[PDB]
């Protein structure tokens, strides 16, 4: 029973993370016909050809001066000096006419992605956020509608149907002819993903006794980490998104063969405070956790090693979260871990000449600090709250994180245009303010 649930968790792990590998943007520039003929005629500087063709984009303007513009010089059927063709033609190179890009650009990568295939650069750059937005919309919509399908059919036919739909959707998306169909299949599988993922957790929690809930939760975390580790290995040997999608989709097809009421928390004034503080903390932590990975997977010079190292530091977080129990109070680790995720974000915007040996350790520290805080909320939930109230609170928090994940990607991706450090100020503010609301949790007049 444990093996099946762990395999299911590991298989669900790449669904919300693979956008780092499936959709990635490489360096590109506008292409002009006839430049190849001159390059064949004159091969003095194949490398400097770019230098001799791409315009001189200035600081902070390279996003809309070399990737979305081209020169109007007629290279073909023109006599050149083979060294500086532009200098001889015109004394000043800042006065020639420009124009919109054409012919689908030219990329520099041995692999392929959705950006490379469908040309999602320049004015269409906002189409990449739809990928995550549709999946999160599916996550939100599938949470409410899963209860009805648990009745009038049974608790057995749902899992098989969800697994079959997920596998078929994955394969068909791997065989998609146009852009709209891929979005449709993403939305279609977004429901069944969480629909089948929640059942494994519920079964694992129910089957094991109350004395090993912590152990099985740690086992689930270890399974998630292992599933995250194996995905980095596959993307190393399969540099095409169709191959990678098929390779991560086929195993799903292969392996298939006087009562606690929710209205009592808002009447007594003592239980109306912590039940709001915990909700706010959970929402903030989920938003931060979702944002950090997407920020990291966009400005990395070494993606594989950074991903592996960041994923390898999530076991000590659980170890310390378990060790701190029964020895220290419940708010000191919470405050410290919430404060550790803000200082790192604040520092991460002030180290220009220290790259390649500091960003990795700072990102690891921030990731561990975020991971520690999430476990404490779950432990407090399991300690202080009854069954039914938490049985609805899990769905409520899932809906909260789903709406947070709907709103996040647009803000994260489209706020980097004004300045590259803007998304790293909101994270610092949220982290540094979430550590000041936990100090209102202790009850006043606590007699020793």
């Amino acid at each position, epitope marked *: 029973a444990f093996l099946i649930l762990c395999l299911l968790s590991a298989a669900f792990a790449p669904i919300c993370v693979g956008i780092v590998f499936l959709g990635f943007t490489p360096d590109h520039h506008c292409q002009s016909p006839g430049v190849a003929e001159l390059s064949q005629r004159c091969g003095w500087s194949p490398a400097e050809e770019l230098n001799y063709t791409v315009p001189g984009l200035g600081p902070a303007g390279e996003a809309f001066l070399g990737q979305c513009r081209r020169y109007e010089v007629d290279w073909n059927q023109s006599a050149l000096s083979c060294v500086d063709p532009l200098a001889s033609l015109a004394t000043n190179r800042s006065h020639l006419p420009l124009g919109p890009c054409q012919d689908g650009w030219v990329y520099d990568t041995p692999g392929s992605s959705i950006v490379t295939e469908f040309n999602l650069v320049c004015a269409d750059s906002w189409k990449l956020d739809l990928f995550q937005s549709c999946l999160n919309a599916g996550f939100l919509f599938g949470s409410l509608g899963v209860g009805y399908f648990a009745d009038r059919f049974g608790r057995k036919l749902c899992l098989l149907g969800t697994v079959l739909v997920n596998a078929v959707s994955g394969v068909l998306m791997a065989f998609s002819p146009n852009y709209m169909s891929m979005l449709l299949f993403r939305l279609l599988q977004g429901l069944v993903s969480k629909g089948n993922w929640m059942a494994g957790y519920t079964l694992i929690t129910e089957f094991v006794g109350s004395g090993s809930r912590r152990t099985v939760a740690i086992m689930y975390q270890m399974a998630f980490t292992v599933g995250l580790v194996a995905l980095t290995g596959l993307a190393y040997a399969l540099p095409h998104w169709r191959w990678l999608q098929l390779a991560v989709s086929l195993p799903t097809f292969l392996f298939l063969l006087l009562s*606690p009421s929710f209205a*009592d928390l808002f009447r*007594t004034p003592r239980l109306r405070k912590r039940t709001f503080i915990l909700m706010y903390l959970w929402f903030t932590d989920s938003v931060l956790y979702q944002g950090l990975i997407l920020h990291m997977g966009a400005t990395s010079g070494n993606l594989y090693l950074d991903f592996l190292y960041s994923a390898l530091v999530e076991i000590p977080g659980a170890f310390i979260a378990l060790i701190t129990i029964d*020895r220290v*109070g*419940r*708010i000191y680790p919470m405050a410290m871990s919430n404060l550790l995720a803000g200082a790192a974000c604040l520092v991460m915007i002030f180290i220009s000449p220290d790259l390649h040996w500091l960003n990795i350790i700072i990102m690891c520290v921030g990731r561990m600090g975020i991971t520690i805080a999430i476990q404490m909320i779950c432990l407090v939930n399991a300690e*202080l709250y*009854p069954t039914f109230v938490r049985n609805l609170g899990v769905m409520v928090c899932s809906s909260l994180c789903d709406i947070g994940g709907i709103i996040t990607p647009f803000i994260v991706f489209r706020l980097r245009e004004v300045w590259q450090a803007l998304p790293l100020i909101l994270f610092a503010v949220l982290g540094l303010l979430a550590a000041g609301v936990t100090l209102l949790l202790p009850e006043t007049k606590g007699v*020793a």
Partner: nanobody, 118 residues
Framework: QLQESGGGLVQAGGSLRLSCAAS????????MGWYRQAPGKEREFVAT???????NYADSVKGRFTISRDNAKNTVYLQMNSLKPEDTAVYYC????????????????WGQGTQVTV
């Protein structure tokens, strides 16, 4: 409102049972426990229990005391057997504070307890 029961005068440290009652709001949303007067000492700790069912114990009474929870009658039970002529104190029912201190050091509710001697 916390109220206790049980108690008596055992002859040679025999088995005895203690019961603590709750109101209904306390019984479902926080953590209960038991504390010992221990004359000559300010306060002593014995055992706890929470919603999940995980239990703690004191290093001096480990393997002799058992705590169980009853949901029908809204009560928390404690069973002591094979006592020794060293446990003569007053037993209180209390609700500790988790967020501040060490998790069992501070109290916000108590019910004046009861006295049992051996």
């Amino acid at each position: 409102q916390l109220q206790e029961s049980g108690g008596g005068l055992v002859q040679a440290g025999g088995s005895l049972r203690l019961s603590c009652a709750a109101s209904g709001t306390i019984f479902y949303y926080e953590i209960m426990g038991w504390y010992r007067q221990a004359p000559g000492k300010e306060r002593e700790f014995v055992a706890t229990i929470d919603q999940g069912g995980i239990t703690n114990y004191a290093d001096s009474v480990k393997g002799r005391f058992t705590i169980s929870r009853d949901n029908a009658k809204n009560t928390v039970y404690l069973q002591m057997n094979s006592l020794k002529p060293e446990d003569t104190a007053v037993y209180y029912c209390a609700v500790p504070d988790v967020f501040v201190g060490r998790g069992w050091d501070y109290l916000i509710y108590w019910g004046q307890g009861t006295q049992v001697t051996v």
